Design a protein around this ligand. Structure first.
Ligand SMILES: *[C@@H]1O[C@H](CO)[C@@H](O[C@@H]2O[C@H](CO)[C@@H](O)[C@H](O)[C@H]2NC(C)=O)[C@H](O)[C@H]1NC(C)=O
Ligand SMILES: CCCCC/C=C\C/C=C\CCCCCCCC(=O)O
Ligand SMILES: *[C@@H]1O[C@H](CO)[C@@H](O)[C@H](O)[C@H]1NC(C)=O
Ligand SMILES: *[C@@H]1O[C@H](CO)[C@@H](O)[C@H](O)[C@H]1NC(C)=O
Ligand SMILES: *[C@@H]1O[C@H](CO)[C@@H](O)[C@H](O)[C@H]1NC(C)=O
Ligand SMILES: *[C@@H]1O[C@H](CO)[C@@H](O)[C@H](O)[C@H]1NC(C)=O
Ligand SMILES: *[C@@H]1O[C@H](CO)[C@@H](O)[C@H](O)[C@H]1NC(C)=O
Lengths: 272, 50, 14, 50, 99
């Protein structure tokens, strides 16, 4: 009641060393801005959000609890998605039970790394208000669309075996009987990585920075063994006009171990 | 003039001495885990073998 | 810090 | 037992082992081979049912 | 320029600008040595070559904190302390690779 919550700040470090985005309702405008902020520890509305801002990248300006306001936030491929919904309530101190569908309002191209967020609240000392936070996960859902196009119900397949039986049949209705369900599943609870004990870096300098290179007709081959293939060291100095992988993706190279490695060297004219 | 280097190898077949940068961990046994052995990735339960 | 239940909240248009 | 044995067969893919493909190929490239295997294995199941 | 495409490895792709695997769009590039190069040399343009971890698609990092491997933050005039950014150094007389 009396709009205590005013907005959010999303950021990684929440200081001036990293960019952050502030979305607030300032009483006479909705303002969104993404800059390097000197965020205060206690951000509230009497406007004590930040001291100074520099290197700004994005800006957007607009033209007995009673009120429940619901939002969903996601971040993806440099886009922050916001979904919104509202419901009148009379519950005293709990989250009312029920079903409501949120609708998109914002798709912002910020291109920042978000690991943390903090809410912005007014101080009067302070009025009674509550907010609630939950976390999202990849899941399969079955949605029911009505004749007008409204989503009025849904089924979460992972909740229990009956919900999966429903999702498998594609029905909210099930007749009496016994049905065969998927086999018992177990989810992993640990991570194991086993690699050989190697303490030496591969000889990039000797191969690439060799004083003399042979003729193509008399090409030379050299064995490579017992070494750590980092190749990020080359980023500082050595650069290649041609780099092509055939049987392997370039992205997977860092996570692999290689057997029977050989390197062949020669010199040709550009056209060849 | 241009300098050319060609690299040849084989993958997830026989023993390997050349490996990429990564940190190893202790073996976990009689438990469902995600594992990576010398670049081969999977999920399963690991037990001693005869 | 109190723990509450989210009964059927959070569905949005895909 | 024939259904069990049929999992060894490639269906135009580079390998019958999914973990190898996922280990040494990126998402888009792995998608093609996995789709080929999916087609083949569904076909085997349908033949058994008939 | 070859690094600007999905599924590529390199300094630019790893630490500066990364394209999503499922990308719909277009990529355009053209040579500008007559306006962005000088005989004395130009060093305004920069790129990042030191980082912890890899970038995510359509994400940018504009930090300039001193870099030390394995954490342990350091003052720049110290062992194993480097500035992460680097300058290109374009010249009129340089080769096509460095234009
Ligand atoms: C987003 O920013 C966080 C900083 O809060 C990055 O976290 C660091 O990532 C490196 C990657 O090797 C780790 O070694 C550090 O330990 C992480 N720091 C923390 C918070 O402990 C995170 O990697 C960034 N995300 C991206 C995609 O760059
Ligand atoms: C010295 C012999 C090297 C042995 C290498 C063996 C296995 C690793 C496979 C490929 C990595 C090497 C090439 C990296 C160049 C990347 C170009 C860039 O990032 O711009
Ligand atoms: C970042 O915050 C610190 C903490 O007081 C301050 O000393 C420093 O000047 C700030 N850097 C800026 C604003 O450039
Ligand atoms: C809200 O922000 C806009 C733009 O900064 C400003 O013009 C307006 O006065 C602000 N309103 C209040 C009440 O601060
Ligand atoms: C940010 O501002 C600082 C000075 O405050 C400047 O040195 C730096 O180049 C600017 N960075 C970017 C990427 O805007
Ligand atoms: C569809 O819209 C009409 C007009 O409001 C309404 O009368 C009808 O009840 C709606 N369909 C429902 C609620 O199932
Ligand atoms: C990259 O090469 C330059 C030129 O000598 C050198 O100054 C710089 O220190 C190198 N970078 C590292 C990480 O040493």
């Amino acid at each position: 009641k009396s709009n205590v919550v005013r907005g959010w700040v999303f950021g990684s470090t929440m200081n001036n060393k990293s960019q952050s985005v502030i979305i607030i309702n300032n009483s006479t405008n909705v303002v969104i801005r993404a800059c390097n902020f000197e965020l205060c520890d206690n951000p509230f509305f009497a406007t004590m959000i930040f001291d100074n801002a520099f290197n700004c990248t994005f800006e957007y300006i607009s033209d007995n609890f009673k009120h429940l306001r619901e939002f969903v936030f996601k971040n993806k491929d440099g886009f922050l998605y916001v979904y919104k919904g509202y419901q009148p309530i009379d519950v005293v101190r709990d989250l009312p039970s029920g079903f409501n569908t949120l609708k998109p309002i914002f798709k912002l191209p910020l291109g920042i790394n978000i690991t943390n967020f903090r809410a912005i609240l007014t101080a009067f000392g302070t009025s009674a208000a509550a907010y609630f936070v939950g976390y999202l996960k990849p899941t399969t859902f079955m949605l029911k669309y009505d004749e007008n196009g409204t989503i009025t119900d849904a089924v979460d397949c992972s909740q229990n075996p009956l919900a999966e039986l429903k999702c498998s049949v594609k029905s909210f209705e099930i007749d009496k009987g016994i049905y065969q369900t998927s086999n018992f599943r177990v989810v992993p609870s640990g991570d194991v990585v086993r690699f050989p004990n190697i303490t030496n870096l591969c000889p990039f300098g000797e191969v690439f920075n060799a004083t003399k290179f042979p003729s193509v007709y008399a090409w030379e081959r050299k064995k490579i063994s017992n070494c750590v293939a980092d190749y990020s060291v080359l980023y500082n100095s050595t650069f290649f006009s041609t780099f092509k992988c055939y049987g392997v993706s370039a992205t997977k190279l860092n996570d692999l171990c290689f057997s029977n490695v050989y390197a062949d060297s020669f010199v040709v004219k550009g056209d060849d | 003039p241009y300098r050319v280097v060609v690299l040849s190898f084989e993958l997830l077949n026989a023993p390997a001495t050349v490996c990429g940068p990564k940190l190893s961990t202790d073996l976990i046994k009689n438990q469902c885990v995600n594992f990576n052995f010398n670049g081969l990735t999977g999920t399963g339960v690991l037990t001693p073998s005869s | 810090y109190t723990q509450h239940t989210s009964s059927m909240r959070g569905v949005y248009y895909p | 037992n024939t259904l069990v044995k049929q999992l060894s067969s490639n269906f135009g893919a580079i390998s019958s082992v999914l973990n190898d493909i996922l280990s040494r190929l990126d998402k888009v490239e792995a998608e093609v081979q996995i789709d080929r295997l999916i087609t083949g294995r569904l076909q085997s199941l349908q033949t058994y049912v008939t | 320029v070859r690094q600007i495409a999905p599924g590529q490895t390199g300094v630019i792709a790893d630490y500066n600008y990364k394209l999503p695997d499922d990308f719909m769009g277009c990529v355009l590039a053209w040579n500008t040595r007559n306006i962005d190069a000088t005989s004395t040399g130009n060093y305004n343009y920069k790129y990042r070559y030191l980082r912890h971890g890899k970038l995510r698609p359509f994400e940018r990092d504009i930090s300039n904190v001193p870099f030390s491997p394995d954490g342990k933050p350091c003052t720049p005039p110290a062992l194993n302390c480097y500035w992460p950014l680097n300058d290109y150094g374009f010249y009129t007389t340089t080769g096509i690779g460095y234009q």
